[PDB]
Ligand SMILES: O=C(O)c1ccc(-c2nn(Cc3c(Cl)cccc3C(F)(F)F)c3ccc(Cl)cc23)c(OCc2ccccc2)c1
């Protein structure tokens with residue numbers, strides 16, 4: 377590829393990434409630092425006032441369940457956002473339809489965790505397009521398996537955010553995740569890896585121009601995909617504990633199907 | 637109101653999801669029904685013995701009409717699942733109130749099943765087991781007690797509906813328009829549902845015009861078919877409640893159980 381083409385590909389993805397995702401990293405960092413202040417959830421009572429404040433649809437019997445299920449609601453929303461962005465990656469829509477489904481089926485969890493760090497600091501997480509803020513303290517302190525469902529995400533995000541990537545970096549990074557040629561059941565891997573080679577090239581040039589003073593940031597960011605695979609697995613294994621433990625969770629079969 | 641280029645994009649988006657979500661497309665169904673091919677020919681079920689040989693051919697305990705009736709329930713549940721997956725891809729649907737999401741599907745899945753079952757039908761019968769079987773209308777109509785005429789209303793609608801000669805790219809938008817109906821009982825926020833339907837209706841009008849330029853007023857004719865569906869769903873529901881209060885032997889799947897509450 378030629379450098380001018382990698383600049384063009386990077387700009388393409390950044391523009392799409394902004395249109396696809398409601399709350400950008402740049403905007404989220406403005407809210408967390410205090411630069412319109414969000415509503416803060418730190419305990420039982422402020423949660424009760426919050427679902428009365430903005431009427432969170434993710435939030436509205438037991439508290440720890442309602443919070444867990446609110447993550448699912450927002451996760452379903454996010455999957456669709458990623459699916460739209462995926463269509464703007466040059467070459468993606470020309471792939472075999474089964475392979476498009478396969479790449480998204482397996483990539484979304486890694487991409488959600490990555491983008492969830494954009495909404496997080498060491499003390500909590502933004503919610504509802506940045507109008508809320510749920511504290512790490514409150515999440516960590518939830519009961520039984522829910523307390524320890526939330527804390528691993530924060531632990532990844534604090535390390536990941538130490539890289540100080542911006543939205544133009546992340547757009548290419550997320551694209552690289554989607555075009556992973558090692559997902560189970562892919563029919564035609566060659567054109568997928570061909571796109572990933574171009575995206576990898578663009579990420580490399582992007583990180584060098586946008587962080588010239590950061591030695592081997594490219595390599596350091598590819599090593600975070602090691603983390604991602606591990607956390608996604610830990611995440612999956614945790615869901616199956618709730619399914620086989622919680623008699624409270626049985627919901628509406630239709631909702632169950634939406635969240636399948 | 638949108639720009640034509642944006643409506644074509646929405647049409648292309650929905651057709652692509654429809655392909656990804658529904659295994660047996662109308663295009664594939666018509667190829668098997670038309671024949672000519674030797675690699676796709678179905679095994680045909682027209683009586684007791686060919687049904688018995690059929691479960692040995694296609695791999696499709698108790699009484700025949702029941703086993704047949706149960707084969708429809710199984711496939712309906714799968715259909716509910718497929719429609720739910722398609723719905724999530726409709727831009728804006730998953731962003732709606734959670735109650736309304738459930739509500740739109742509760743009432744819409746039957747109208748959509750009937751519509752898409754027409755794709756699997758001609759005047760003589762229906763494809764089964766992902767198009768590997770074909771059961772004759774004659775055979776269904778001749779089932780006993782209340783089950784005989786349980787199957788027949790579907791055929792009556794399908795023969796008329798297939799006369800519009802829609803293809804999958806048209807049906808994709810049509811199905812979406814059905815789901816995002818703002819006049820379903822118990823919806824909390826009709827406005828955001830209606831704004832989505834305006835976009836889907838806009839997309840449908842443009843799609844039908846480009847893809848059937850010589851089909852005068854096909855848009856309006858296709859909306860007048862949404863009238864039929866509402867009537868057939870009611871007759872269907874009322875017939876199940878007869879079976880439920882007659883066959884205590886038989887039992888319904890929880891997903892369908894809930895949809896009719
Ligand atoms: O606005 C966003 O971009 C956004 C994305 C992700 C989360 C979120 N998801 N999950 C669990 C999870 C993950 Cl991580 C990945 C796939 C599927 C799921 C699951 F289980 F929900 F299905 C979390 C677990 C812990 C935390 Cl603090 C956040 C998440 C999100 O939450 C914001 C949120 C937190 C509390 C209550 C409501 C909403 C937002």
Ligand SMILES: O=C(O)c1ccc(-c2nn(Cc3c(Cl)cccc3C(F)(F)F)c3ccc(Cl)cc23)c(OCc2ccccc2)c1
Pocket residue numbers: 704705707708709710711712715746749750752753756762763764765771776786787788790892
């Ligand atoms: O391949 C498909 O996409 C497909 C979809 C629908 C049917 C089918 N369902 N039903 C009854 C029904 C309806 Cl209509 C809606 C909700 C719930 C139910 C019920 F009662 F079963 F719970 C039928 C009644 C009459 C007819 Cl000829 C078809 C159907 C279907 O059958 C194909 C089929 C016919 C025989 C044996 C096995 C499968 C297929």
